[PDB]
Structures are given as structure tokens and as C-alpha cells.
Amino acid sequence: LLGTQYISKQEYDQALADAQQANAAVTAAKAAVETARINLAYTKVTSPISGRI
Amino acid sequence: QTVRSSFNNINASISSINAYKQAVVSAQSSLDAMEAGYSVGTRTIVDVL
């Protein structure tokens, strides 16, 4: 939409803005998801080492 | 008068085209603005119409 200059470079700036931060929110999410899942990984206790129990 | 009548007309007449001729250009990309915006579907086709 910017090829033929049909928007505001300002505008496109704004669009990329969230599109930038959006994924970051995603990053905030996947980081989040792993967190609990990690805890669910904590649940189902893993032997932190190997050997005779 | 008539001498000055149209001689103005044509000139102002000239100004006419220059406006709309631009104005056409105005709508021109304006159309184009639509089609792309519709081409990408950011906008409807009705607008293009």
C-alpha cells in the first residue's frame, strides 16, 4: 500500500509499530506459555541427575 | 465587451481545465488509491466503483 504512496509513511509507521510490538507481546506470551509449561515440566518431577533412586 | 467577454472566458476557461485536469489527476490516483486498497482488500470494491 506504500508502493504507489497510497498511505502515510507516518501511517505505515504506525502499522509497523504494533506489528513490531505485537510479536513482542507474542514474545511476552510464548515466554509466558513456557513459564507455566515449564512448571508443568516441574510437575512430573525430573531427576535432576542420574543414578540409583 | 464581447471582445473582453470571451477573451476572459477562454482564459478562465483555461483555468478550468488546469483545475479539473489536475482534478482528474486527483481522482486519478484516487482511483488508483482505491484499486490497490481493494487489490490488497484493505478496502471494498464499491469504493473503486
Side-chain angles (χ1 to χ4, degrees):
Chain A
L1 303 162
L2 60 85
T4 21
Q5 195 36 269
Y6 297 143
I7 68 173
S8 175
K9 182 182 178 179
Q10 176 57 55
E11 296 163 351
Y12 169 76
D13 294 342
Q14 188 58 58
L16 174 60
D18 182 6
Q20 185 177 359
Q21 59 179 16
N23 303 337
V26 170
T27 300
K30 294 177 178 177
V33 173
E34 183 173 1
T35 304
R37 178 184 61 201
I38 294 170
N39 297 339
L40 278 68
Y42 288 132
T43 63
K44 178 192 296 178
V45 298
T46 57
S47 174
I49 69 169
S50 294
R52 174 182 295 280
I53 187 165
Chain B
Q1 182 175 357
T2 298
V3 172
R4 293 173 65 91
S5 298
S6 297
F7 183 81
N8 292 129
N9 299 344
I10 179 170
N11 297 335
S13 176
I14 296 169
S15 179
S16 177
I17 298 168
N18 298 129
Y20 305 135
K21 189 183 292 178
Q22 177 66 261
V24 177
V25 174
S26 66
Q28 183 57 59
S29 298
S30 176
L31 176 64
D32 289 339
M34 294 298 95
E35 297 183 354
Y38 174 74
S39 64
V40 291
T42 63
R43 296 191 298 279
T44 186
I45 185 63
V46 182
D47 303 348
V48 170
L49 294 177

